């Protein structure tokens, strides 16, 4: 259900499905599960977790830098991602275990 983020390396080309949690799922942690393409059975899908706030900001930046050529679908994506970014507080995260979901 949840994940932990450490910094093996997969580029943006081999990314197909990203999964962004909400402000109530994993505490108040913005986490993103990035999963490779599913095409094939000889080919397994690899899932690596990442900082959800950074992914959401990256996609907000990409969608904003292309607002002139944006469909209503991507416009809705922009609006919901902006409200998702404002749902997580980077404050109220100082005394929290920043490795809450690392099981070692």
């Amino acid at each position: 259900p949840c994940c932990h983020v450490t910094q093996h390396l997969l580029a943006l080309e081999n990314i197909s499905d990203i999964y962004l949690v909400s402000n109530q799922t994993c505490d108040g942690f913005s986490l993103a599960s990035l999963n490779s393409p599913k095409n094939g059975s000889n080919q397994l899908v690899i899932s690596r977790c990442a900082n959800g706030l950074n992914v959401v900001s990256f996609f907000i930046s990409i969608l904003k830098r292309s607002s002139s050529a944006l469909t209503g679908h991507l416009r809705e994506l922009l609006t919901t991602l902006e409200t998702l970014y404002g749902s997580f507080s980077v404050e109220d995260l100082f005394g929290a275990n920043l490795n809450r979901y690392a099981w070692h």
Partner: peptide, 21 residues
């Protein structure tokens, strides 16, 4: 002039929560 991978590298997606904070 739009490069998604450039901003992907600049975003530091794999940055842990400790270093991000």
């Amino acid at each position: 002039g739009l490069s998604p991978e450039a901003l992907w590298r600049e975003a530091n997606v794999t940055e842990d929560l400790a270093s991000m904070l």
